[PDB]
C-alpha cells in the first residue's frame, strides 16, 4: 500500500529521488525553465553533480514526510502552506506539482514493483488541491 511504498522509497531514497526527478525533467522538458543549471546535461551528467543529488534527495525527504503525515492520501494543510510559502517555490503554479506527480505515477507503473500507483495518483491530486487552497495559483 501507500505506507509500504513510503518505506520502500525511503529505503533507497537518493536513487528513487534522482530517477523520478529525471523522469519528470525528460517528460516535461519546459520544466527546466525553473532549473537553469540542469540544461544541456545527460542523466549521467546530472547524477555526477553534488548539488543535483543533494537537492533532489532533500525534496524527496520532505515529500516522504508529507506522504507519511497524510491520512487516506490527504496531506496536512500545514504541509501544503509550507510548500506554498517556501521562497524557493516563489514562482510556481499547481501545474508544476501536477507534472511531478504524473511522472512519479508513470515511473511507478513502469517499474517492476507492486507500488500502489493509484494511491500516489490520488495523493498528487489531493496535494495539488491543498496547494490551491493554501494560495498557489
Ligand atoms: C511535493 C513536492 C515538492 C517538495 C516536497 C519540494 C521540496 C523542496 C525542498 C525541500 C527544497 C529545498 C531543496 C534544497 O534546499 O536543496 C525545494 C527547492 C526547490 N523546489 Fe521544490 N518541492 C516540491 C515540488 C517542486 C516542484 C514541482 C518544483 C518545480 C517544478 C519545485 C521547484 C523547486 C525549486 C526551483 C527549488 C529551488 C532550487 C534550489 O535548490 O536552488 N519544487 N523544494
Ligand atoms: O533537483 C532539485 C534541485 C534543487 C531544488 C529542488 C529540486 C527538485 C528535485 C525534484 C523535484 C522537485 C525539485 O524542486
PDB file of N, CA, C and O in Angstrom, residues 12-80:
ATOM      1  N   UNK A  12      15.766   3.489  -0.476  1.00  0.00           N
ATOM      2  CA  UNK A  12      16.837   3.779  -1.460  1.00  0.00           C
ATOM      3  C   UNK A  12      16.582   5.173  -2.019  1.00  0.00           C
ATOM      4  O   UNK A  12      16.557   5.344  -3.277  1.00  0.00           O
ATOM      5  N   UNK A  13      16.437   6.148  -1.129  1.00  0.00           N
ATOM      6  CA  UNK A  13      15.746   7.413  -1.488  1.00  0.00           C
ATOM      7  C   UNK A  13      16.548   8.199  -2.520  1.00  0.00           C
ATOM      8  O   UNK A  13      15.936   8.795  -3.402  1.00  0.00           O
ATOM      9  N   UNK A  14      17.868   8.214  -2.401  1.00  0.00           N
ATOM     10  CA  UNK A  14      18.748   9.033  -3.275  1.00  0.00           C
ATOM     11  C   UNK A  14      18.609   8.522  -4.712  1.00  0.00           C
ATOM     12  O   UNK A  14      18.675   9.382  -5.618  1.00  0.00           O
ATOM     13  N   UNK A  15      18.421   7.215  -4.931  1.00  0.00           N
ATOM     14  CA  UNK A  15      18.269   6.687  -6.317  1.00  0.00           C
ATOM     15  C   UNK A  15      16.839   6.894  -6.800  1.00  0.00           C
ATOM     16  O   UNK A  15      16.713   7.418  -7.891  1.00  0.00           O
ATOM     17  N   UNK A  16      15.821   6.659  -5.980  1.00  0.00           N
ATOM     18  CA  UNK A  16      14.413   6.882  -6.399  1.00  0.00           C
ATOM     19  C   UNK A  16      14.248   8.378  -6.632  1.00  0.00           C
ATOM     20  O   UNK A  16      13.624   8.743  -7.648  1.00  0.00           O
ATOM     21  N   UNK A  17      14.790   9.242  -5.758  1.00  0.00           N
ATOM     22  CA  UNK A  17      14.599  10.693  -5.929  1.00  0.00           C
ATOM     23  C   UNK A  17      15.167  11.129  -7.284  1.00  0.00           C
ATOM     24  O   UNK A  17      14.486  11.880  -8.026  1.00  0.00           O
ATOM     25  N   UNK A  18      16.397  10.714  -7.560  1.00  0.00           N
ATOM     26  CA  UNK A  18      17.090  11.080  -8.815  1.00  0.00           C
ATOM     27  C   UNK A  18      16.308  10.508 -10.006  1.00  0.00           C
ATOM     28  O   UNK A  18      15.994  11.249 -10.961  1.00  0.00           O
ATOM     29  N   UNK A  19      15.946   9.235  -9.971  1.00  0.00           N
ATOM     30  CA  UNK A  19      15.292   8.599 -11.148  1.00  0.00           C
ATOM     31  C   UNK A  19      13.941   9.255 -11.386  1.00  0.00           C
ATOM     32  O   UNK A  19      13.548   9.419 -12.575  1.00  0.00           O
ATOM     33  N   UNK A  20      13.175   9.516 -10.325  1.00  0.00           N
ATOM     34  CA  UNK A  20      11.830  10.113 -10.537  1.00  0.00           C
ATOM     35  C   UNK A  20      11.968  11.569 -11.031  1.00  0.00           C
ATOM     36  O   UNK A  20      11.215  12.003 -11.917  1.00  0.00           O
ATOM     37  N   UNK A  21      12.875  12.329 -10.459  1.00  0.00           N
ATOM     38  CA  UNK A  21      13.024  13.737 -10.891  1.00  0.00           C
ATOM     39  C   UNK A  21      13.506  13.772 -12.370  1.00  0.00           C
ATOM     40  O   UNK A  21      13.088  14.629 -13.159  1.00  0.00           O
ATOM     41  N   UNK A  22      14.372  12.847 -12.767  1.00  0.00           N
ATOM     42  CA  UNK A  22      14.862  12.806 -14.184  1.00  0.00           C
ATOM     43  C   UNK A  22      13.677  12.412 -15.065  1.00  0.00           C
ATOM     44  O   UNK A  22      13.566  12.969 -16.183  1.00  0.00           O
ATOM     45  N   UNK A  23      12.819  11.468 -14.608  1.00  0.00           N
ATOM     46  CA  UNK A  23      11.629  11.073 -15.378  1.00  0.00           C
ATOM     47  C   UNK A  23      10.788  12.325 -15.604  1.00  0.00           C
ATOM     48  O   UNK A  23      10.271  12.555 -16.707  1.00  0.00           O
ATOM     49  N   UNK A  24      10.700  13.178 -14.600  1.00  0.00           N
ATOM     50  CA  UNK A  24       9.909  14.434 -14.674  1.00  0.00           C
ATOM     51  C   UNK A  24      10.561  15.394 -15.691  1.00  0.00           C
ATOM     52  O   UNK A  24       9.849  15.852 -16.550  1.00  0.00           O
ATOM     53  N   UNK A  25      11.857  15.644 -15.595  1.00  0.00           N
ATOM     54  CA  UNK A  25      12.583  16.594 -16.490  1.00  0.00           C
ATOM     55  C   UNK A  25      12.528  16.130 -17.944  1.00  0.00           C
ATOM     56  O   UNK A  25      12.376  16.999 -18.828  1.00  0.00           O
ATOM     57  N   UNK A  26      12.630  14.826 -18.199  1.00  0.00           N
ATOM     58  CA  UNK A  26      12.622  14.275 -19.578  1.00  0.00           C
ATOM     59  C   UNK A  26      11.194  14.303 -20.122  1.00  0.00           C
ATOM     60  O   UNK A  26      11.029  14.579 -21.322  1.00  0.00           O
ATOM     61  N   UNK A  27      10.184  14.001 -19.303  1.00  0.00           N
ATOM     62  CA  UNK A  27       8.770  14.043 -19.740  1.00  0.00           C
ATOM     63  C   UNK A  27       8.281  15.460 -20.089  1.00  0.00           C
ATOM     64  O   UNK A  27       7.458  15.579 -21.021  1.00  0.00           O
ATOM     65  N   UNK A  28       8.737  16.465 -19.350  1.00  0.00           N
ATOM     66  CA  UNK A  28       8.320  17.891 -19.379  1.00  0.00           C
ATOM     67  C   UNK A  28       9.546  18.782 -19.509  1.00  0.00           C
ATOM     68  O   UNK A  28       9.954  19.461 -18.574  1.00  0.00           O
ATOM     69  N   UNK A  29      10.223  18.745 -20.680  1.00  0.00           N
ATOM     70  CA  UNK A  29      11.466  19.488 -20.857  1.00  0.00           C
ATOM     71  C   UNK A  29      11.346  20.986 -20.526  1.00  0.00           C
ATOM     72  O   UNK A  29      12.291  21.547 -19.973  1.00  0.00           O
ATOM     73  N   UNK A  30      10.177  21.582 -20.774  1.00  0.00           N
ATOM     74  CA  UNK A  30       9.949  23.023 -20.479  1.00  0.00           C
ATOM     75  C   UNK A  30      10.065  23.259 -18.970  1.00  0.00           C
ATOM     76  O   UNK A  30      10.239  24.414 -18.625  1.00  0.00           O
ATOM     77  N   UNK A  31      10.025  22.219 -18.104  1.00  0.00           N
ATOM     78  CA  UNK A  31      10.152  22.429 -16.636  1.00  0.00           C
ATOM     79  C   UNK A  31      11.578  22.828 -16.291  1.00  0.00           C
ATOM     80  O   UNK A  31      11.797  23.376 -15.170  1.00  0.00           O
ATOM     81  N   UNK A  32      12.519  22.660 -17.220  1.00  0.00           N
ATOM     82  CA  UNK A  32      13.912  23.109 -16.979  1.00  0.00           C
ATOM     83  C   UNK A  32      13.930  24.644 -16.845  1.00  0.00           C
ATOM     84  O   UNK A  32      14.954  25.172 -16.392  1.00  0.00           O
ATOM     85  N   UNK A  33      12.851  25.368 -17.180  1.00  0.00           N
ATOM     86  CA  UNK A  33      12.849  26.857 -17.058  1.00  0.00           C
ATOM     87  C   UNK A  33      13.078  27.169 -15.567  1.00  0.00           C
ATOM     88  O   UNK A  33      13.737  28.157 -15.276  1.00  0.00           O
ATOM     89  N   UNK A  34      12.684  26.286 -14.644  1.00  0.00           N
ATOM     90  CA  UNK A  34      12.835  26.519 -13.177  1.00  0.00           C
ATOM     91  C   UNK A  34      14.156  25.956 -12.661  1.00  0.00           C
ATOM     92  O   UNK A  34      14.382  26.041 -11.440  1.00  0.00           O
ATOM     93  N   UNK A  35      14.913  25.288 -13.511  1.00  0.00           N
ATOM     94  CA  UNK A  35      16.132  24.542 -13.115  1.00  0.00           C
ATOM     95  C   UNK A  35      17.202  24.767 -14.169  1.00  0.00           C
ATOM     96  O   UNK A  35      17.765  23.779 -14.742  1.00  0.00           O
ATOM     97  N   UNK A  36      17.512  26.050 -14.354  1.00  0.00           N
ATOM     98  CA  UNK A  36      18.503  26.536 -15.341  1.00  0.00           C
ATOM     99  C   UNK A  36      19.793  25.700 -15.325  1.00  0.00           C
ATOM    100  O   UNK A  36      20.202  25.321 -16.400  1.00  0.00           O
ATOM    101  N   UNK A  37      20.405  25.405 -14.170  1.00  0.00           N
ATOM    102  CA  UNK A  37      21.757  24.778 -14.133  1.00  0.00           C
ATOM    103  C   UNK A  37      21.670  23.290 -14.521  1.00  0.00           C
ATOM    104  O   UNK A  37      22.722  22.634 -14.553  1.00  0.00           O
ATOM    105  N   UNK A  38      20.476  22.785 -14.850  1.00  0.00           N
ATOM    106  CA  UNK A  38      20.297  21.373 -15.296  1.00  0.00           C
ATOM    107  C   UNK A  38      20.149  21.280 -16.812  1.00  0.00           C
ATOM    108  O   UNK A  38      20.018  20.174 -17.286  1.00  0.00           O
ATOM    109  N   UNK A  39      20.203  22.380 -17.537  1.00  0.00           N
ATOM    110  CA  UNK A  39      20.049  22.419 -19.023  1.00  0.00           C
ATOM    111  C   UNK A  39      21.276  21.804 -19.702  1.00  0.00           C
ATOM    112  O   UNK A  39      22.399  22.069 -19.178  1.00  0.00           O
ATOM    113  N   UNK A  40      21.066  21.115 -20.851  1.00  0.00           N
ATOM    114  CA  UNK A  40      22.129  20.656 -21.748  1.00  0.00           C
ATOM    115  C   UNK A  40      22.980  19.551 -21.115  1.00  0.00           C
ATOM    116  O   UNK A  40      24.138  19.436 -21.462  1.00  0.00           O
ATOM    117  N   UNK A  41      22.394  18.769 -20.200  1.00  0.00           N
ATOM    118  CA  UNK A  41      23.082  17.690 -19.440  1.00  0.00           C
ATOM    119  C   UNK A  41      22.338  16.373 -19.667  1.00  0.00           C
ATOM    120  O   UNK A  41      21.071  16.406 -19.708  1.00  0.00           O
ATOM    121  N   UNK A  42      23.091  15.283 -19.858  1.00  0.00           N
ATOM    122  CA  UNK A  42      22.545  13.912 -19.879  1.00  0.00           C
ATOM    123  C   UNK A  42      22.189  13.514 -18.431  1.00  0.00           C
ATOM    124  O   UNK A  42      22.723  14.131 -17.454  1.00  0.00           O
ATOM    125  N   UNK A  43      21.372  12.486 -18.280  1.00  0.00           N
ATOM    126  CA  UNK A  43      21.058  11.957 -16.923  1.00  0.00           C
ATOM    127  C   UNK A  43      22.347  11.663 -16.138  1.00  0.00           C
ATOM    128  O   UNK A  43      22.445  12.059 -14.944  1.00  0.00           O
ATOM    129  N   UNK A  44      23.324  11.005 -16.752  1.00  0.00           N
ATOM    130  CA  UNK A  44      24.588  10.612 -16.044  1.00  0.00           C
ATOM    131  C   UNK A  44      25.337  11.879 -15.602  1.00  0.00           C
ATOM    132  O   UNK A  44      25.877  11.903 -14.450  1.00  0.00           O
ATOM    133  N   UNK A  45      25.350  12.930 -16.426  1.00  0.00           N
ATOM    134  CA  UNK A  45      25.972  14.222 -16.060  1.00  0.00           C
ATOM    135  C   UNK A  45      25.265  14.785 -14.818  1.00  0.00           C
ATOM    136  O   UNK A  45      25.962  15.204 -13.863  1.00  0.00           O
ATOM    137  N   UNK A  46      23.950  14.814 -14.836  1.00  0.00           N
ATOM    138  CA  UNK A  46      23.155  15.325 -13.689  1.00  0.00           C
ATOM    139  C   UNK A  46      23.462  14.506 -12.452  1.00  0.00           C
ATOM    140  O   UNK A  46      23.788  15.102 -11.450  1.00  0.00           O
ATOM    141  N   UNK A  47      23.565  13.189 -12.556  1.00  0.00           N
ATOM    142  CA  UNK A  47      23.771  12.338 -11.366  1.00  0.00           C
ATOM    143  C   UNK A  47      25.203  12.484 -10.810  1.00  0.00           C
ATOM    144  O   UNK A  47      25.488  11.981  -9.719  1.00  0.00           O
ATOM    145  N   UNK A  48      26.102  13.115 -11.556  1.00  0.00           N
ATOM    146  CA  UNK A  48      27.506  13.314 -11.121  1.00  0.00           C
ATOM    147  C   UNK A  48      27.624  14.622 -10.326  1.00  0.00           C
ATOM    148  O   UNK A  48      28.654  14.780  -9.616  1.00  0.00           O
ATOM    149  N   UNK A  49      26.638  15.524 -10.465  1.00  0.00           N
ATOM    150  CA  UNK A  49      26.660  16.843  -9.818  1.00  0.00           C
ATOM    151  C   UNK A  49      26.218  16.616  -8.352  1.00  0.00           C
ATOM    152  O   UNK A  49      25.105  16.105  -8.125  1.00  0.00           O
ATOM    153  N   UNK A  50      27.141  16.821  -7.402  1.00  0.00           N
ATOM    154  CA  UNK A  50      26.941  17.058  -5.938  1.00  0.00           C
ATOM    155  C   UNK A  50      25.569  17.628  -5.637  1.00  0.00           C
ATOM    156  O   UNK A  50      24.771  16.936  -4.845  1.00  0.00           O
ATOM    157  N   UNK A  51      25.289  18.789  -6.246  1.00  0.00           N
ATOM    158  CA  UNK A  51      24.062  19.585  -5.986  1.00  0.00           C
ATOM    159  C   UNK A  51      22.835  18.822  -6.441  1.00  0.00           C
ATOM    160  O   UNK A  51      21.780  18.907  -5.770  1.00  0.00           O
ATOM    161  N   UNK A  52      22.910  18.145  -7.584  1.00  0.00           N
ATOM    162  CA  UNK A  52      21.704  17.504  -8.157  1.00  0.00           C
ATOM    163  C   UNK A  52      21.198  16.468  -7.163  1.00  0.00           C
ATOM    164  O   UNK A  52      20.011  16.432  -6.862  1.00  0.00           O
ATOM    165  N   UNK A  53      22.116  15.637  -6.690  1.00  0.00           N
ATOM    166  CA  UNK A  53      21.806  14.528  -5.767  1.00  0.00           C
ATOM    167  C   UNK A  53      21.284  15.117  -4.478  1.00  0.00           C
ATOM    168  O   UNK A  53      20.274  14.700  -3.967  1.00  0.00           O
ATOM    169  N   UNK A  54      21.956  16.161  -3.998  1.00  0.00           N
ATOM    170  CA  UNK A  54      21.705  16.715  -2.644  1.00  0.00           C
ATOM    171  C   UNK A  54      20.381  17.502  -2.694  1.00  0.00           C
ATOM    172  O   UNK A  54      19.582  17.359  -1.729  1.00  0.00           O
ATOM    173  N   UNK A  55      20.071  18.233  -3.775  1.00  0.00           N
ATOM    174  CA  UNK A  55      18.791  18.989  -3.832  1.00  0.00           C
ATOM    175  C   UNK A  55      17.630  18.010  -4.088  1.00  0.00           C
ATOM    176  O   UNK A  55      16.568  18.102  -3.427  1.00  0.00           O
ATOM    177  N   UNK A  56      17.824  17.041  -4.976  1.00  0.00           N
ATOM    178  CA  UNK A  56      16.689  16.145  -5.314  1.00  0.00           C
ATOM    179  C   UNK A  56      16.375  15.257  -4.098  1.00  0.00           C
ATOM    180  O   UNK A  56      15.179  15.077  -3.803  1.00  0.00           O
ATOM    181  N   UNK A  57      17.388  14.773  -3.389  1.00  0.00           N
ATOM    182  CA  UNK A  57      17.096  13.931  -2.237  1.00  0.00           C
ATOM    183  C   UNK A  57      16.361  14.777  -1.196  1.00  0.00           C
ATOM    184  O   UNK A  57      15.418  14.228  -0.608  1.00  0.00           O
ATOM    185  N   UNK A  58      16.784  16.014  -0.933  1.00  0.00           N
ATOM    186  CA  UNK A  58      16.128  16.806   0.139  1.00  0.00           C
ATOM    187  C   UNK A  58      14.650  17.013  -0.201  1.00  0.00           C
ATOM    188  O   UNK A  58      13.804  17.023   0.704  1.00  0.00           O
ATOM    189  N   UNK A  59      14.374  17.259  -1.474  1.00  0.00           N
ATOM    190  CA  UNK A  59      13.000  17.394  -1.999  1.00  0.00           C
ATOM    191  C   UNK A  59      12.225  16.146  -1.593  1.00  0.00           C
ATOM    192  O   UNK A  59      11.104  16.269  -1.020  1.00  0.00           O
ATOM    193  N   UNK A  60      12.791  14.983  -1.871  1.00  0.00           N
ATOM    194  CA  UNK A  60      12.044  13.729  -1.622  1.00  0.00           C
ATOM    195  C   UNK A  60      12.017  13.393  -0.128  1.00  0.00           C
ATOM    196  O   UNK A  60      10.988  12.835   0.345  1.00  0.00           O
ATOM    197  N   UNK A  61      13.035  13.801   0.630  1.00  0.00           N
ATOM    198  CA  UNK A  61      12.959  13.687   2.108  1.00  0.00           C
ATOM    199  C   UNK A  61      11.665  14.364   2.574  1.00  0.00           C
ATOM    200  O   UNK A  61      10.880  13.747   3.334  1.00  0.00           O
ATOM    201  N   UNK A  62      11.414  15.584   2.101  1.00  0.00           N
ATOM    202  CA  UNK A  62      10.186  16.300   2.558  1.00  0.00           C
ATOM    203  C   UNK A  62       8.960  15.653   1.926  1.00  0.00           C
ATOM    204  O   UNK A  62       7.911  15.528   2.624  1.00  0.00           O
ATOM    205  N   UNK A  63       9.028  15.235   0.665  1.00  0.00           N
ATOM    206  CA  UNK A  63       7.835  14.617   0.009  1.00  0.00           C
ATOM    207  C   UNK A  63       7.409  13.368   0.813  1.00  0.00           C
ATOM    208  O   UNK A  63       6.188  13.192   1.062  1.00  0.00           O
ATOM    209  N   UNK A  64       8.363  12.579   1.301  1.00  0.00           N
ATOM    210  CA  UNK A  64       8.005  11.364   2.042  1.00  0.00           C
ATOM    211  C   UNK A  64       7.381  11.736   3.387  1.00  0.00           C
ATOM    212  O   UNK A  64       6.477  10.994   3.880  1.00  0.00           O
ATOM    213  N   UNK A  65       7.884  12.801   4.031  1.00  0.00           N
ATOM    214  CA  UNK A  65       7.315  13.320   5.296  1.00  0.00           C
ATOM    215  C   UNK A  65       5.845  13.656   5.091  1.00  0.00           C
ATOM    216  O   UNK A  65       4.974  13.338   5.956  1.00  0.00           O
ATOM    217  N   UNK A  66       5.619  14.409   4.016  1.00  0.00           N
ATOM    218  CA  UNK A  66       4.285  14.922   3.698  1.00  0.00           C
ATOM    219  C   UNK A  66       3.373  13.704   3.446  1.00  0.00           C
ATOM    220  O   UNK A  66       2.246  13.655   3.997  1.00  0.00           O
ATOM    221  N   UNK A  67       3.843  12.761   2.638  1.00  0.00           N
ATOM    222  CA  UNK A  67       3.151  11.471   2.414  1.00  0.00           C
ATOM    223  C   UNK A  67       2.854  10.783   3.730  1.00  0.00           C
ATOM    224  O   UNK A  67       1.722  10.274   3.928  1.00  0.00           O
ATOM    225  N   UNK A  68       3.855  10.718   4.629  1.00  0.00           N
ATOM    226  CA  UNK A  68       3.751   9.930   5.856  1.00  0.00           C
ATOM    227  C   UNK A  68       2.749  10.558   6.836  1.00  0.00           C
ATOM    228  O   UNK A  68       2.047   9.775   7.600  1.00  0.00           O
ATOM    229  N   UNK A  69       2.674  11.883   6.858  1.00  0.00           N
ATOM    230  CA  UNK A  69       1.730  12.605   7.724  1.00  0.00           C
ATOM    231  C   UNK A  69       0.308  12.580   7.138  1.00  0.00           C
ATOM    232  O   UNK A  69      -0.536  13.013   7.885  1.00  0.00           O
ATOM    233  N   UNK A  70       0.101  12.226   5.853  1.00  0.00           N
ATOM    234  CA  UNK A  70      -1.235  12.243   5.199  1.00  0.00           C
ATOM    235  C   UNK A  70      -2.136  11.228   5.889  1.00  0.00           C
ATOM    236  O   UNK A  70      -1.596  10.223   6.436  1.00  0.00           O
ATOM    237  N   UNK A  71      -3.441  11.466   5.913  1.00  0.00           N
ATOM    238  CA  UNK A  71      -4.465  10.400   6.166  1.00  0.00           C
ATOM    239  C   UNK A  71      -5.212  10.068   4.868  1.00  0.00           C
ATOM    240  O   UNK A  71      -5.717  11.017   4.197  1.00  0.00           O
ATOM    241  N   UNK A  72      -5.339   8.790   4.532  1.00  0.00           N
ATOM    242  CA  UNK A  72      -6.041   8.329   3.300  1.00  0.00           C
ATOM    243  C   UNK A  72      -5.597   9.178   2.118  1.00  0.00           C
ATOM    244  O   UNK A  72      -6.440   9.564   1.342  1.00  0.00           O
ATOM    245  N   UNK A  73      -4.291   9.415   1.999  1.00  0.00           N
ATOM    246  CA  UNK A  73      -3.669  10.152   0.861  1.00  0.00           C
ATOM    247  C   UNK A  73      -4.072  11.630   0.853  1.00  0.00           C
ATOM    248  O   UNK A  73      -3.881  12.260  -0.174  1.00  0.00           O
ATOM    249  N   UNK A  74      -4.568  12.155   1.972  1.00  0.00           N
ATOM    250  CA  UNK A  74      -4.921  13.587   2.126  1.00  0.00           C
ATOM    251  C   UNK A  74      -3.822  14.225   2.973  1.00  0.00           C
ATOM    252  O   UNK A  74      -3.656  13.873   4.150  1.00  0.00           O
ATOM    253  N   UNK A  75      -3.043  15.143   2.406  1.00  0.00           N
ATOM    254  CA  UNK A  75      -1.897  15.724   3.113  1.00  0.00           C
ATOM    255  C   UNK A  75      -2.401  16.756   4.106  1.00  0.00           C
ATOM    256  O   UNK A  75      -3.513  17.291   3.885  1.00  0.00           O
ATOM    257  N   UNK A  76      -1.604  17.035   5.139  1.00  0.00           N
ATOM    258  CA  UNK A  76      -1.913  18.130   6.095  1.00  0.00           C
ATOM    259  C   UNK A  76      -1.972  19.478   5.382  1.00  0.00           C
ATOM    260  O   UNK A  76      -1.111  19.786   4.513  1.00  0.00           O
ATOM    261  N   UNK A  77      -2.869  20.342   5.851  1.00  0.00           N
ATOM    262  CA  UNK A  77      -2.939  21.736   5.395  1.00  0.00           C
ATOM    263  C   UNK A  77      -1.643  22.464   5.788  1.00  0.00           C
ATOM    264  O   UNK A  77      -1.156  23.307   4.992  1.00  0.00           O
ATOM    265  N   UNK A  78      -1.097  22.190   6.953  1.00  0.00           N
ATOM    266  CA  UNK A  78       0.185  22.819   7.372  1.00  0.00           C
ATOM    267  C   UNK A  78       1.300  22.451   6.382  1.00  0.00           C
ATOM    268  O   UNK A  78       2.160  23.276   6.082  1.00  0.00           O
ATOM    269  N   UNK A  79       1.319  21.233   5.836  1.00  0.00           N
ATOM    270  CA  UNK A  79       2.398  20.827   4.902  1.00  0.00           C
ATOM    271  C   UNK A  79       2.200  21.563   3.573  1.00  0.00           C
ATOM    272  O   UNK A  79       3.224  21.983   2.920  1.00  0.00           O
ATOM    273  N   UNK A  80       0.946  21.752   3.150  1.00  0.00           N
ATOM    274  CA  UNK A  80       0.641  22.448   1.884  1.00  0.00           C
ATOM    275  C   UNK A  80       1.064  23.920   2.024  1.00  0.00           C
ATOM    276  O   UNK A  80       1.706  24.445   1.134  1.00  0.00           O
TER     277      UNK A  80
END
